């Protein structure tokens, strides 16, 4: 159900970084500012999961989800064409501004992400890759009288398509049931809150893959956020039992209170 974009309409500009099995570039579509997510040459099973993401994203609309225009085919290159979100990934931005980002700013972002995940939950759709890298800043919201404005990115290559090693690499955003449903986004949401409160540094980042796996193997409790305003929420979200995690309806109602 994805849209087709033709090679003649897109211009590739500067390299922005890399995703899971992708190279990401600024681009131009026909003329719109866009981001081009170029899939590494891959087997059908990766290519399919890429196209499944493009389809899921073409079917949803939300003020806090970024837009996907479609997929272009440039020979062996599968390219997703997406909205350019002005100030880029949130985690990189928070690490730059660490010590400048007030608690109220982080609560706005938490409500905005919970709102987007609430809408996906009602559609019975799973994002699968909720992390700070996949949150993009449309408005910075640090100046006076301004509020930030985030937009959640597409999940990229789907979670079920990736390797065990890539899953270990996503700890602690990766829900523990996924190491060997909509409930996994509640874990990812809780981990992203820890990352946001820790100014873009997520727990267990310095640790090795076998250490990360050991943390999950022993079901060790993740840390508490650096603000009591979210300690209860993140604790309910970061429970190893998926059925004991709150719904996003509840999460959102608590964050606005």
Helices (H), 132-200: 164-169, 183-197
Residue 136 lies near ligand ZOQ (rule: CB under 6 A): yes
The burial class, CB within 10 Å (0-12 / 13-18 / 19+), for 254 is middle
Q: Is 141 helix (H, G, I), strand (E, B) or coil?
A: coil
Query: Which member of 19, 148, 188, 200 binds ligand ZOQ (CB under 6 A)?
Result: 19
Q: Choose one: 2-10, 19-27, 97-105, 170-178; the region binding ligand ZOQ (CB under 6 A).
A: 19-27
- Classify residue 156 as left (phi > 0), alpha (psi -120 to 50) or beta: left
Q: Is 76 helix (H, G, I), strand (E, B) or coil?
A: coil
Q: For ligand ZOQ, which is the closer residue by CB, 37 or 167? A: 37
Q: Is 119 helix (H, G, I), strand (E, B) or coil?
A: helix
Q: Choose one: 16-24, 141-149, 170-178, 207-215; the region binding ligand ZOQ (CB under 6 A).
A: 16-24
Q: Are strands 77-83 and 135-139 parallel, antiparallel or unpaired?
A: unpaired
Q: For ligand ZOQ, which is the closer residue by CB, 162 or 233? A: 162
Q: Which residue is nearest to ligand ZOQ (CB)?
A: 19
Residue 37 lies near ligand ZOQ (rule: CB under 6 A): yes
Q: For ligand ZOQ, which is the closer residue by CB, 118 or 153? A: 153
Q: Smallest gap, in angstroms, from Cβ of residue 58 to ligand ZOQ?
A: 12
Residue 91 lies near ligand ZOQ (rule: CB under 6 A): no
Q: What are phi and psi of 190, to 5 degrees?
A: -65, -40
- Classify residue 124 as left (phi > 0), alpha (psi -120 to 50) or beta: left
CA distance 53 to 32: 21
Q: How many residues bind ligand ZOQ (CB under 6 A)?
A: 19
Site residues (vs ligand ZOQ, CB under 6 A): 16-17, 19, 22, 24, 35, 37, 66, 82-85, 88-89, 133-134, 136, 153-154
């Amino acid at each position: 159900s994805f849209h087709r974009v033709d090679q003649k309409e897109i211009t590739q500009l500067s390299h922005l970084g890399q995703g899971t099995r992708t190279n990401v570039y600024e681009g131009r579509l026909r003329e719109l500012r866009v981001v081009l997510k170029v899939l590494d040459p891959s087997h059908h099973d990766i290519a399919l999961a890429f196209y499944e993401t493009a389809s899921l994203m073409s079917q949803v609309s939300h003020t806090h989800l970024a837009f996907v225009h479609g997929v272009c085919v440039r020979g062996p290159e599968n390219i997703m064409v997406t909205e350019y979100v002005e100030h880029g990934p949130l985690d990189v931005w928070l690490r730059r501004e660490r010590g400048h980002v007030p608690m109220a700013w982080k609560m706005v972002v938490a409500q905005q992400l919970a709102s987007a995940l609430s809408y996906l939950e009602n559609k019975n759709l799973v994002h699968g890759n909720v992390c700070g890298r996949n949150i993009l800043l449309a408005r910075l919201g640090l100046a006076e009288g301004t509020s930030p404005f985030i937009k959640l990115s597409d999940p990229g290559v789907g979670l079920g398509a990736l390797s065990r090693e890539e899953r270990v690499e996503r700890i602690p955003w990766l829900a523990p049931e996924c190491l060997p449903s909509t409930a996994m986004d509640k874990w990812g949401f809780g981990a992203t809150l820890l990352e946001i409160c820790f100014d873009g540094e997520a727990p267990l980042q310095s640790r090795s893959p076998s250490e990360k796996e050991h943390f999950y193997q022993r079901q060790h409790r993740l840390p508490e956020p650096s603000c009591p305003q979210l300690a209860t929420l993140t604790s309910q979200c970061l429970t190893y039992e998926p059925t004991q995690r709150p719904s996003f309806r509840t999460i959102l109602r608590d964050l606005t209170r």
